[PDB]
Symmetry: C2
Subunit: 81 residues, 2 copies
């Protein structure tokens, strides 16, 4: 097995990236058939990672997890200061 299939093929992760007035959204879908304990782990890991990157470089990167089929990361165009 080349790994978990989220709907894009074995082992494939394929975000959609879109440009908005205030920043860029990076959306990861296909999370509907992820184990509930690991859906939580994925969300907590991504939240920690973007907090560390934001701490280092000064951007208010944010994560939206409405407990469904997808996660979305917001990358502001401008630094916080």
């Amino acid at each position: 097995s080349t790994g978990i299939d989220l709907g894009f093929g074995p082992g494939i992760v394929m975000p959609s990236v879109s440009n908005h007035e205030g920043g860029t959204y990076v959306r990861y879908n296909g999370l509907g058939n992820v184990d509930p304990n690991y859906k939580n782990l994925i969300s907590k890991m991504m939240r920690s990672l973007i907090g560390q990157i934001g701490n280092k470089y000064g951007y208010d990167i944010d994560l939206f997890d409405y407990q469904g089929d997808f996660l979305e990361v917001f990358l502001p165009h401008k630094p916080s200061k």
Copy 2:
């Protein structure tokens, strides 16, 4: 009809908690996520691939050569360079 317990995976910091360990070395900050030895390896690989994709998008946008170090062991490590590309 069936549903399992969803209390939270414990990586060593308490159920459901993720903690980084942060250090500074040759040209950047290293962020190490320890405690992954008992994570289902199928999900560890998915998390690694999602992290690699996300740091690629972030590094492209903001102009830093952020990288991921994965040895298929009990940690994942992200490198955040001090200076832009």
